[PDB]
Design a protein around this ligand. Structure first.
Ligand code: CE
Ligand code: CE
Length: 691
């Protein structure tokens, strides 16, 4: 019996009591064991877990944030599920409840009394204070935002607030002795029910709680009818219209654990069983989501219906969402800073080389652009979802992943039109035509055709990319129906695959032979140029890139060791009909048309991003002023850093504003079918966050 049990952290004795009886009800059913640690508060529980004196604790969104900061760096592993089994949900609503009779609105709360669940809590603090910020006249740090709130409401109860500094924030609290304004059950006006009671007793005029509270504490439509909700559009509405009248939709509470060795498996298994044996209306003995007559929400939310496992790739920031995560951060910043962040564009670069060019561009951007980075394209997508970065140009294959994650396309890379336009002046409005995905091979391997490419050595720009992967693998998968992608070719270089896999054999990493198969420019065989090089150096027999890639790296067009002497004539294209044509005939010999690369971003940065990039390219574009005098956005010496060097300009999407519409139904269907074989951690995570 190696595992002794999962160590749960309680924050009160009544919680510890419910814990201990959970422990015995567990072994009584012979299920996974669970012990109980005792502490005074969430942060104590958070610390206890970070230093191995405990394993799990469930926290509100506000503390999930805290719990995720250094040195704790805890992770949300399971989310509470609310609603009904018919329509479950891993989120709830932060609303403002008031009694019928008054007439004030959400914008007329000054001088009135308020009831909060507790300091730093989602519904009780972070959401309402964030929503009311423009009425607070707060001047920003180092002046605590609390002081501003203390001057806004004539009085209130904010469990946990500093009684000495902000006595006004505790004035309404009903706790006796040193328990007044206590962040615990001792304070009768603590948490959702507490803050709600504070409203009923008349101590306050407005309570900031979740949508269910009124339905949980009031069993009788008659009473519920004495209450209303303050909607952000400054109007009132029935307490059952929260879906149309809430201050914010927020992620449910979640059990958190260490990221080091958190024993996620143990916790999940314990929660999985506990949910079935003592879950919602399961056993009469013990009840996981129920509490005594004088208690509420002990260990978990009362009336919650179960747990939902949280995908491994999700950290606290990702779990909280772009909006909420940054909203919390914005509570600790002046309005000048927030507005400044709202105006700048944080590009994310993949790898050091892209980072170097980004910084170079940042310095010449006049404060409009700054940089961030990760070692893979997906990590960057994660950084954008967290608000730590805002934009990047992606291959169509990635636009798909970015789309499933909620990001949208904003501008596309435009290439030289089907035929001569002469440094086009209307490049910005010339619809994109896509580029040609082809399969290149050496002229000399005369017997190599498309019908016999299987089993050979392959070169791919990277896994999940259009020309290099989605199209060639999709064509082959359509034939065999086999998901065993790593057997399509004897061996290859497909950056982004498993290093121990044959899909990585041919890769060569960088000069030191490091970063083998890494999906960024450090791997010399990465991307278009990298995949072609993989062929030109006889590493592979076929390379899946686009047509203009050969042209650019042959006939002196690229003066680099490996490509200095390569000639266009020494390469051919494999057509789907078995024929072999010269690269110059790609127009009638290509695997498929691929949608252009596009710049993606969050919906909230679209307009700003669009005007910044348009200004920036006018300055450093193909025919920009400062290029090549000072800097050129679309140049990186055949490195295709940040953008494709053959980018004429960034153009408008003419309506194709979503990934589904930009990539097109067919390509999207094709990719989806390809994903059935396997999904990445990013997609797994985004699927979870979209539910
Ligand atoms: Ce909450
Ligand atoms: Ce591409």
């Amino acid at each position: 019996r190696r595992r002794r049990s999962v160590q749960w952290c309680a924050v009160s004795n009544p919680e510890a009591t419910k814990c201990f009886q959970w422990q015995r009800n567990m072994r009584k059913v012979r299920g996974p064991p669970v012990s109980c640690i005792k502490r005074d508060s969430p942060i104590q529980c958070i610390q206890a877990i970070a230093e191995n004196r405990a394993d799990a604790v469930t926290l509100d969104g506000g503390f999930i944030y805290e719990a995720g900061l250094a040195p704790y760096k805890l992770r949300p592993v399971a989310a509470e599920v609310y609603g009904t089994e018919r329509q479950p949900r891993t989120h709830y609503y932060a609303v403002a409840v008031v009694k019928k009779g008054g007439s004030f609105q959400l914008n007329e709360l000054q001088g009135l009394k308020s009831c909060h669940t507790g300091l730093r809590r989602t519904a009780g603090w972070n959401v309402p204070i964030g929503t009311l910020r423009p009425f607070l006249n707060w001047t920003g740090p180092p002046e605590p935002i609390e002081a501003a709130v203390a001057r806004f409401f004539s009085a209130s109860c904010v469990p946990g607030a500093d009684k000495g500094q902000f006595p006004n924030l505790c004035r309404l609290c009903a706790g006796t002795g040193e328990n007044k304004c206590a962040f615990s059950s001792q304070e009768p006006y603590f948490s959702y029910s507490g803050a709600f009671k504070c409203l009923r007793d008349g101590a306050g005029d407005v309570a900031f709680i979740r949508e269910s509270t009124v339905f949980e504490d009031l069993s009788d439509e008659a009473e519920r009818d004495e209450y209303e909700l303050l909607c952000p559009d400054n109007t009132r509405k029935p307490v059952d219209k929260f879906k149309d009248c809430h201050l914010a939709r927020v992620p449910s509470h979640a059990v958190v654990a260490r990221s080091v060795n958190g024993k996620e498996d143990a916790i999940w298994n314990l929660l999985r069983q506990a949910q079935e044996k003592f879950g919602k209306d399961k056993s009469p003995k013990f009840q996981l989501f129920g509490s005594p007559s004088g208690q509420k929400d002990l260990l978990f939310k009362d009336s919650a219906i179960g747990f939902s496992r949280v995908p491994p790739r999700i950290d606290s920031g990702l779990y909280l969402g772009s909006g909420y995560f940054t909203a919390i951060q914005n509570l600790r910043k002046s309005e000048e800073e927030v507005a400044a962040r709202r105006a700048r564009v944080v590009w994310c670069a993949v790898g050091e080389q892209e980072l170097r060019k980004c910084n170079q561009w940042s310095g010449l951007s006049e404060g409009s652009v700054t940089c961030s980075s990760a070692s893979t394209t997906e990590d960057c997508i994660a950084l954008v979802l967290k608000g730590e970065a805002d934009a990047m140009s992606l291959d169509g294959g990635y636009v798909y992943t970015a789309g499933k994650c909620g990001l949208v396309p904003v501008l596309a890379e435009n290439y030289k039109s089907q035929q001569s336009s002469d440094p086009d002046p209307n490049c910005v409005d010339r619809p994109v035509e896509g580029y040609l995905a082809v399969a290149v091979v050496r002229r000399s391997d005369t017997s190599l055709t498309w019908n016999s490419v299987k089993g050979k050595k392959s070169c791919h720009t990277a896994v999940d990319r259009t020309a290099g992967w989605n199209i060639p693998m999709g064509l082959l998968f359509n034939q065999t129906g086999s998901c065993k992608f790593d057997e399509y070719f004897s061996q290859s270089c497909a950056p982004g695959s498993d290093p121990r896999s044959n899909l990585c054999a041919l890769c060569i990493g960088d000069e030191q032979g490091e970063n083998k198969c890494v999906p960024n420019s450090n791997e010399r065989y990465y991307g278009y140029t990298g995949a072609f090089r993989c062929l030109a150096e006889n590493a592979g027999d076929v390379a899946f890139v686009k047509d203009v890639t050969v042209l650019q790296n042959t006939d002196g067009n690229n003066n680099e060791a490996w490509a200095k002497d390569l000639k266009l004539a020494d390469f051919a294209l494999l057509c789907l009909d078995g024929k072999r044509k010269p690269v110059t005939e790609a127009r009638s010999c290509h695997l498929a048309m691929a949608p252009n690369h596009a710049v993606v971003s969050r919906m909230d940065k679209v307009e700003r991003l669009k005007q910044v990039l348009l200004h920036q390219q006018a300055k450093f574009g193909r025919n920009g002023s400062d290029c090549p005098d000072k800097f050129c956005l679309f140049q990186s010496e055949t490195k295709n850093l940040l953008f494709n060097d053959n980018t004429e300009c960034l153009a408008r999407l003419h309506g194709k504003t979503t990934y589904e519409k930009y990539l097109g139904p067919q390509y999207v269907a094709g990719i989806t079918n390809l994903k059935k074989c396997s999904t990445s951690p990013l997609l797994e995570a985004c699927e979870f966050l979209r539910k």
